[PDB]
């Protein structure tokens, strides 16, 4: 299935790895991968099949009290769909800029370029700046000095967001998806371009340095909480778990297949292509270090812009750079567009199933899809302004990643493992797929996953360190509060639902608890 490769792999993993110093990210990344990553991904898919309904309705058949998990999930996809599409706007802008005789980021001789620029080759023939980096910052981004200075709304980027959103609306409205012969090209094209990029990176005259930085752990980094949540939550983000889409995916259709084998096959492959595409990014960074005569830790931005700094450099050192630059962004667009369709479609399905009486009562569903895209487009405008990067960084860290995913993951395992009961869950899976989860799955939900999620959460709070764009910009206090509001918007679902249903139920307290703990309500 195409949704198990995406911008989480080719854009999110390399930047987080680079931000956390590289090889020290891989220790907590693998620990969560098997400890919680795969076991939770199997858990969600079973829930969807077991009920054969949306991510919100299923919990009614498992533990009515904790139905808020479904609400917590649907809000997460709503926030994710707002800022994830912004990456397609940057790719769209790059693609149009690629339709030129010479790529603008190859050299710095234009009006938007600083007087401090020095070409990489001549930089080692001061506080010089590479043309590639400042093209991203000044031309594509026009970075503001801080989040407190929104600046002007970039009209060019606003049109790019409109173009991608329009494509999403028509595709969703008309149900356009890869089902025919085009599936071979759509699925194969990401891996074909990534192999060429990977080969280009390794063959660079300084690839070796980058791959050592990528793989050798600085174990003194593991004494900081940041790398544990960043690594652990990246597993949840990249698997699209805790979003409720996987529950909807299972309910859509599943039969005559071993779900256990499929989930491990999908989950190992999704993680493999992140690790594999890590070499490509770091290999390029290694070469940029020696060419620029600076540390590998400082060559590029320690943020979402890494993918828009490294890969554009790689395409510049290939025969006919324009040809490969075009192919890259029509692979960053198609790989990200298919993902956007799945989560926009899932969000629409999740929302209509709550109020089918009015929205799903007729043709209003078409109007609802336009409304969802419209409001999302307006929300995305905040991240298109000159200071939009700080908003985008804030959204990525908090809106649909970080503690919020841990919050959802902990309750999902806890409810099934202890409240619903592990034995009953294993009993269900026996009926569905014929064999029990086994000790690895049973203990992971019961012990490993709750402990890891809880441990990271406490370890963060005890050793709290505030978010910072790149590695030098400190967010203001109000900005941090806004970020926590986005994360709390999903976490607060579970407690809010619990109290609402405890109040909306008749009888003494204990009767209400017993009634809402028993499934099938």
């Amino acid at each position, epitope marked *: 299935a195409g949704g198990f490769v995406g911008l989480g792999n080719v854009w999110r993993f390399p930047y987080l790895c680079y931000k956390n110093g590289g090889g020290a990210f891989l220790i907590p990344y693998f620990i969560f991968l098997f400890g919680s990553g795969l076991p939770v991904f199997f858990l969600e898919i079973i829930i969807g099949q077991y009920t054969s309904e949306g991510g919100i309705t299923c919990w009614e058949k498992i533990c009515p009290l904790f139905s808020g998990i479904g609400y917590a999930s649907v809000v997460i996809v709503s926030l994710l769909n707002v800022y994830y599409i912004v990456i397609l706007a940057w790719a769209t802008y790059y693609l149009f800029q690629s339709f030129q005789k010479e790529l603008p980021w190859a050299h710095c001789n234009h009006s938007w370029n600083t007087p401090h620029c020095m070409e990489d080759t001549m930089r080692k023939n001061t506080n010089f700046t590479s043309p590639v980096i400042e093209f991203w910052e000044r031309n594509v981004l026009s970075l503001s000095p801080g989040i407190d200075h929104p600046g002007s709304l970039k009209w060019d980027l606003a049109l790019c967001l409109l173009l991608v959103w329009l494509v999403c609306f028509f595709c969703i409205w008309k149900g356009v998806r890869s089902t025919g012969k085009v599936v071979y090209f759509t699925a194969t094209f990401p891996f074909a371009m990534l192999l060429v990029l990977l080969v280009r990176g390794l063959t660079l005259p300084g690839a070796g340095a980058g791959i050592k930085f990528y793989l050798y752990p600085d174990i003194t980094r593991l004494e900081d909480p940041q790398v544990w949540i960043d690594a652990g939550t990246q597993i949840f983000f990249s698997y699209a778990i805790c979003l409720g889409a996987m529950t909807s995916l299972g309910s859509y259709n599943k039969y005559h297949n071993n779900v256990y084998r499929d989930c491990m096959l999908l989950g190992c492959l999704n993680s493999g292509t992140s690790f594999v595409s890590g070499f490509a990014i770091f290999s390029i960074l290694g070469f940029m270090a020696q060419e620029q005569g600076v540390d590998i830790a400082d060559v590029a931005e320690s943020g979402p812009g890494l993918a828009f700094i490294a890969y554009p450099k790689a395409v510049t050192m290939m025969p006919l750079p324009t040809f490969w630059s075009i192919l890259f962004f029509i692979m960053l667009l198609l790989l990200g567009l298919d993902s956007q369709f799945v989560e926009v479609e899932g969000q629409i399905t999740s929302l209509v199933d709550l109020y089918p009486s009015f929205l799903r009562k007729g043709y209003r569903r078409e109007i609802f899809i336009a409304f969802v895209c419209s409001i999302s487009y307006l929300l995305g405008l905040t991240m298109v302004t000159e200071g939009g990067m700080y908003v985008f960084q804030l959204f990525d860290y908090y809106a649909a990643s970080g503690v919020c995913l841990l919050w959802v993951a902990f309750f999902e395992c806890f409810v099934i493992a202890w409240i619903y009961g592990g*034995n009953r869950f294993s009993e269900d899976i026996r009926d569905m797929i*014929g064999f029990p989860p086994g000790p690895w799955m049973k203990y992971s939900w019961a012990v490993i996953t709750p402990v890891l999620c809880v441990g990271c959460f406490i370890f963060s709070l005890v050793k709290y360190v505030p978010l910072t764009y790149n590695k030098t910009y400190v967010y203001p206090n109000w900005a941090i509060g806004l970020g926590w509001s986005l994360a709390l918007s999903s976490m607060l679902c579970v407690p809010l639902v619990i109290v609402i249903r405890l109040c909306q139920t008749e009888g003494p307290f204990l009767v209400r608890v017993k009634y809402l703990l028993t499934p099938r309500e």
Partner: antibody
């Protein structure tokens, strides 16, 4: 898993009722699904019913869907099969088998008890 | 019910000679959901082959299994004196479980 032993077999008449039992030992009876298999005097094997590990899912053969009731006692580690409308064709030897994993089949079989409805 | 039919009900065999019995299903059966059981005269059946290719704990490597979809069979490299027994094919894909007619090796 070492021992599975059936008991309770005997002679009855048409339209009668009987309760078959199968004690289990050597393994955690609660965590393994149990099934009943029937072997007619012609040596033909016929499936009767199966009960999940926890007893929440119970299934019956078409011939005994509305006549036989399957139950288990996890605390006592004993498997029970109840017949209420035994017919003339119900005479056979009954075996209790462990069927936890569908992809692996019945790992172990009991000694079995003969039932006749003469 | 997913009726399972075994063609060679009776197979007279001499020691050393290889034999093979074919089990046919009236409906689609998964590869992992078909198993073979051996039953010796006056004894309860014992699992022999599962997943259509995997040998049980006690069955020697002498036996092997093959098949998929709607036709399944197992073969014996060299029938020994201890191989004289009745073999039944069973399907687990559908829940109204059905056992094959059974093929009895009389020698």
């Amino acid at each position: 898993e070492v021992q599975l032993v059936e008991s309770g077999g005997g002679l009855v008449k048409p339209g009668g009722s009987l309760k078959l039992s199968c004690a289990a030992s050597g393994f955690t009876f609660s965590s393994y699904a149990m099934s009943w298999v029937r072997q007619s005097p012609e040596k033909r094997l016929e499936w009767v019913a199966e009960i999940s590990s926890g007893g929440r899912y119970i299934y019956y053969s078409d011939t005994v869907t509305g006549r036989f009731t399957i139950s288990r006692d996890n605390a006592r580690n004993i498997l029970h099969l109840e017949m209420s409308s035994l017919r003339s064709e119900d005479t056979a030897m009954y075996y209790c088998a462990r069927g936890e994993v569908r992809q692996r089949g019945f790992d172990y079989w009991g000694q079995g008890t003969t039932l006749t409805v003469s | 019910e997913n009726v399972l039919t075994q063609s060679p009900a009776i197979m007279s065999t001499s020691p050393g000679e290889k034999v093979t019995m074919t089990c046919r299903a009236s409906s689609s059966v998964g590869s992992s959901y078909l198993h073979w059981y051996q039953q010796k005269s006056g004894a309860s059946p014992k699992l022999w082959i599962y997943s259509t290719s995997n040998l049980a704990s006690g069955v020697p490597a002498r036996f092997s299994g093959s098949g998929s979809g709607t036709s399944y069979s197992l073969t014996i490299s060299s029938v020994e004196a201890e191989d004289a027994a009745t073999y039944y094919c069973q399907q687990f894909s559908g829940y109204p479980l059905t056992f094959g007619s059974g093929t009895k090796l009389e020698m």
